[PDB]
Amino acid sequence: GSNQNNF
Numbered sequence: 001g002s003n004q005n006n007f
């Protein structure tokens, strides 16, 4: 699966 971190 793809991951996205929005800090």
Ligand SMILES: [Zn+2]
Binding pocket: 001, 002, 003
């Ligand atoms: Zn993955």
